[PDB]
Design a protein around this motif. Sequence first.
Motif, PDB file in Angstrom:
ATOM      1  N   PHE A 141      39.161  28.983  32.527  1.00 25.68           N
ATOM      2  CA  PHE A 141      38.295  29.367  33.624  1.00 25.68           C
ATOM      3  C   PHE A 141      37.035  30.058  33.117  1.00 25.68           C
ATOM      4  O   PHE A 141      37.051  30.757  32.111  1.00 25.68           O
ATOM      5  N   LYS A 142      35.942  29.821  33.836  1.00 25.82           N
ATOM      6  CA  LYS A 142      34.726  30.613  33.778  1.00 25.82           C
ATOM      7  C   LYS A 142      34.618  31.309  35.126  1.00 25.82           C
ATOM      8  O   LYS A 142      35.308  30.923  36.069  1.00 25.82           O
ATOM      9  N   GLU A 143      33.789  32.348  35.212  1.00 26.97           N
ATOM     10  CA  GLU A 143      33.482  32.946  36.499  1.00 26.97           C
ATOM     11  C   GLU A 143      32.003  32.741  36.790  1.00 26.97           C
ATOM     12  O   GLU A 143      31.170  32.942  35.914  1.00 26.97           O
ATOM     13  N   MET A 157      29.160  34.357  46.339  1.00 27.59           N
ATOM     14  CA  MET A 157      30.573  34.444  46.005  1.00 27.59           C
ATOM     15  C   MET A 157      30.728  34.462  44.496  1.00 27.59           C
ATOM     16  O   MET A 157      29.869  33.940  43.805  1.00 27.59           O
ATOM     17  N   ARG A 158      31.784  35.126  44.017  1.00 22.64           N
ATOM     18  CA  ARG A 158      32.254  34.965  42.655  1.00 22.64           C
ATOM     19  C   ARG A 158      33.408  33.972  42.696  1.00 22.64           C
ATOM     20  O   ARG A 158      34.354  34.154  43.468  1.00 22.64           O
ATOM     21  N   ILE A 159      33.328  32.926  41.885  1.00 21.39           N
ATOM     22  CA  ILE A 159      34.260  31.814  41.961  1.00 21.39           C
ATOM     23  C   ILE A 159      34.805  31.600  40.560  1.00 21.39           C
ATOM     24  O   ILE A 159      34.004  31.392  39.659  1.00 21.39           O
ATOM     25  N   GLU A 174      30.820  24.128  36.616  1.00 22.94           N
ATOM     26  CA  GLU A 174      29.922  24.411  37.723  1.00 22.94           C
ATOM     27  C   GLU A 174      30.193  23.481  38.899  1.00 22.94           C
ATOM     28  O   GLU A 174      30.171  23.932  40.049  1.00 22.94           O
ATOM     29  N   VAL A 175      30.451  22.200  38.605  1.00 21.55           N
ATOM     30  CA  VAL A 175      30.656  21.198  39.638  1.00 21.55           C
ATOM     31  C   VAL A 175      31.804  21.635  40.532  1.00 21.55           C
ATOM     32  O   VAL A 175      31.714  21.470  41.749  1.00 21.55           O
ATOM     33  N   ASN A 207      25.246  30.900  38.399  1.00 24.24           N
ATOM     34  CA  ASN A 207      25.119  31.648  37.161  1.00 24.24           C
ATOM     35  C   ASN A 207      26.503  32.030  36.656  1.00 24.24           C
ATOM     36  O   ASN A 207      27.292  32.602  37.408  1.00 24.24           O
ATOM     37  N   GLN A 208      26.778  31.746  35.383  1.00 27.33           N
ATOM     38  CA  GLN A 208      27.997  32.204  34.745  1.00 27.33           C
ATOM     39  C   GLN A 208      27.892  33.701  34.538  1.00 27.33           C
ATOM     40  O   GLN A 208      26.825  34.169  34.169  1.00 27.33           O
TER      41      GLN A 208
END
Lengths: 172, 189, 197, 136, 106
Positions: free
Chosen positions: A4-6, A27-29, A34-35, A62-63
């Motif tokens: 995972f990335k955030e 939101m933080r996802i 990114e997609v 943005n990461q």
Amino acid sequence: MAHFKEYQVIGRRLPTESVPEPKLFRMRIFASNEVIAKSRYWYFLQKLHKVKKASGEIVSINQINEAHPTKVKNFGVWVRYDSRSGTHNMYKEIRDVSRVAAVETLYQDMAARHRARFRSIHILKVAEIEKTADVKRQYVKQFLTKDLKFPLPHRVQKSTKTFSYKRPSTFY
Amino acid sequence: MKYIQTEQQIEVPEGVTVSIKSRIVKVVGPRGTLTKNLKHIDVTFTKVNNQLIKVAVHNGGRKHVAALRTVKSLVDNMITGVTKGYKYKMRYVYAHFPINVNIVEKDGAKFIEVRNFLGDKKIRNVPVRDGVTIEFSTNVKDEIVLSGNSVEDVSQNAADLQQICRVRNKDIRKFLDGIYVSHKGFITE
Amino acid sequence: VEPVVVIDGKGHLVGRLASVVAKQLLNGQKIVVVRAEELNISGEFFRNKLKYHDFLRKATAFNKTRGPFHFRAPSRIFYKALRGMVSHKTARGKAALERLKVFEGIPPPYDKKKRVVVPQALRVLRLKPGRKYTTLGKLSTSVGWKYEDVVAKLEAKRKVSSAEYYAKKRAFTKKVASANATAAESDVAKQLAALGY
Amino acid sequence: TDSIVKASNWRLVEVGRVVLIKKGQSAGKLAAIVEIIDQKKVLIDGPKAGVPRQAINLGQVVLTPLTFALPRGARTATVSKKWAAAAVCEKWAASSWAKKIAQRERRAALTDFERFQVMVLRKQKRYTVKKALAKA
Amino acid sequence: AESHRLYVKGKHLSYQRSKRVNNPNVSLIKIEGVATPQDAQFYLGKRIAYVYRASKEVRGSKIRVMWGKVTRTHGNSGVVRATFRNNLPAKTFGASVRIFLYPSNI
RNA sequence: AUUGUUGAAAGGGAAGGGCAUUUGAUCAGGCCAGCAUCAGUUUUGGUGGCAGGAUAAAUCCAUAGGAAUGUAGCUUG
RNA sequence: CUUUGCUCCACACAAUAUAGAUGGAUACGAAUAAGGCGUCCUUGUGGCGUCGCUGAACCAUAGCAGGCUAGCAACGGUGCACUUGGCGGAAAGGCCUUGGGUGCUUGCUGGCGAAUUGCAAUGUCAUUUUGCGUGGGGAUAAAUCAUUUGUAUACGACUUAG
Ligand SMILES: [Mg+2]
Ligand SMILES: [Mg+2]
Ligand SMILES: [Mg+2]
């Protein structure tokens, strides 16, 4: 999913003539790219607000890297998920060096212990528990004692060859 | 949840000497010697001093950690047995037919023989396990007393005797005849 | 690498050992297994006895001599596990099984030959400590094998002879390791230590 | 008389325990344990060797017998200060373990001529050793 | 010396195959000492011989040879694929082959 | 079709067939390879220069504040 | 007791055909939440030291596929045949040992040889099985049919006798 990335994802309803500057929602996802992050953004916005990808736009993605990726932190994690019967909230605690590592563990856990797949889970909040008194779970608390030491009994060394010419030792 | 560390203490008293190696425990005291193989459990024994042994489980589940306090008790009972000893008392109970108990020999063996149980012509025989000592108390009527270092040998030998006198094809709420354990205790008190 | 490999069955798991032996033979390696009576199977004894009884129930109804045949000896239980992991009805499979021998105990000539183990099949490296397991000699006796005591008597005797052999070699290994230590601090020994020897 | 329990003298996962990394891009290098995350994960740091501060699965590492005093969660500079004070590099190089690692590396490096020289020397050492076993 | 060997030992394991169809045009070879595809890369292109004996002498010998070459690696465990001028006979599954050190790139 | 004899060959509950090669027998009309330099297709390594992002985040250095799974010091036991 | 048949051994000479030699299958047992080795002594479930983190080892390994010779230093290593005594019955058919003999020795230093298989071609060195011929030893029967029996029997078979 994956590793995972955030992502910060920021969106809005498209401007009208009436409303030329709509309100921006963020939101933080957690997602593996990114997609997927953009897809999740709409998935959640549509649960909250009258909006949909067709009638909206992503303004930014943005990461967000971890501030201190080699400080060990105790995270609280609030989760909603669907069982086979119903829908439940849960608080779990996870000790790791990053939010992204905490979420990987959370997802693996919910799969192991509750057979909840990614589709069945919503991460409501992830937060570093600032003080050790506020940790509520025995399975985390036990790693916070003073001068913690422990052995690893019964060590098994993986062999390269099929045959070994001496019985192995499990000592350490 | 696996517990990082659970630990019990075994208090060794003055006269007794505990040797442990590859989980084979030898205890030696005034009353004699007991051994016990514990190779069926993953525990780690450790000497604090001459008066204290710790026993620990590392990274253990609920079932594993349950075993640990068992291990403490089994080793504690070995120590009690070789200082204080164990003595179980059993009374005979009968409406009509006096149960008639006495020790015999069948090829230098030793056997608790039970005659007349509910007027039965069958003679019941119960081996005396090695290291158990039988005696019939005089002060109390119809009382047998088993005694020994090993509580597992003593207690099982009493159960052997209680069970040989089970009543068949009758209502056991009425027919209360038998030889029951009345008192578990020590030799020295 | 060796032209025959002698595996000491003791402390190994039936299926995991079977799987490795089967592959070795198909690749044209002669194998001998010894001490098949000391082999293990995961699962408590009772479970494994029950499984063997289920297997005994199977027989050609119209004539019990038409198989399946229920071999009881430890070596033959191991051979059954193996035979199932080889295409034993083909000529290649028949050839592969001719490259295998299995024995209870360690008979001559293999009693004076090195015995290897197979770490991928060792019980002590494979089972989670606490999990219960069967020993195959006990199982075999319970389902009608007759030679547990003979093998035990013969193995006790072999181990007496073997301990004497070892005591002598352990003595000769002192003399050598002593004479190698005086050879250290020579020019030759220091030169060898440069080149990694 | 005296009781006599054995031991089992395990290497402990603890802050300050030196470890030899076995798998990955830092493989073969030493590193200290700085914090314990959980039963399987620890935070390691190997400033001297160039092992970056990182969370690592204890399966990727071998605990060594060396330990040195280190505060929990010490940062890299502190690790580096305490490591050189404690003389962890030299303590490691003196061990039979480290020497074997080195020997294995040395033998692997030998030229074909060096292998030939080795045979000639072993033949020489053998001559004198076997002469000494005859006497005694 | 005692040893005269200038080849590495291998075994013919199989033809290339799926579950239920073999392809005799390619053989699989296990080379002694090679445990990974990275190591197997060294042996790519090296000549292989299967040497075997016959009763009838032909052109002054009773030993015959089938020549091939190693072509590429196979799987994760250092097996290689090989192709022979005429395909190896299936009787030789388990038989020994010789992997030469030529053509050399050391 | 079916049969005898001779010769050759194979044969653990059919036989026969396909692809491939070994072995034996038999047979018609350049044959079989090695290296180098290329081209087409492809596979597997080594290594160089750049761009972006929080112009990565960190580490590191400086500085302000903080606490505890509280280091020194101190005070009792 | 005559096609000189049978057998064993040695040696040639043929064939035979290989489920696959190509330096060495290199011997404690037991445990694994424990062990191995060394050492010391009150000999123990003993004290002390040391090892592991794989055989990536150990041993062997140079010479016309390994020639012909000269020395030095050790009196060691090793092969072959022959002897001495012992141990091994699980499938022992092997392990160990005495003694002398005879080779070889790359432990060290010399001299001579090698070519043209032409720039590679297994480039032939192993192991079975059987025959055949020489020389040397050794041994000198049965079974079946037919007849016969009835403890047996459809026929074979079985059990008896000559
Ligand atoms: Mg009634
Ligand atoms: Mg039967
Ligand atoms: Mg090209």
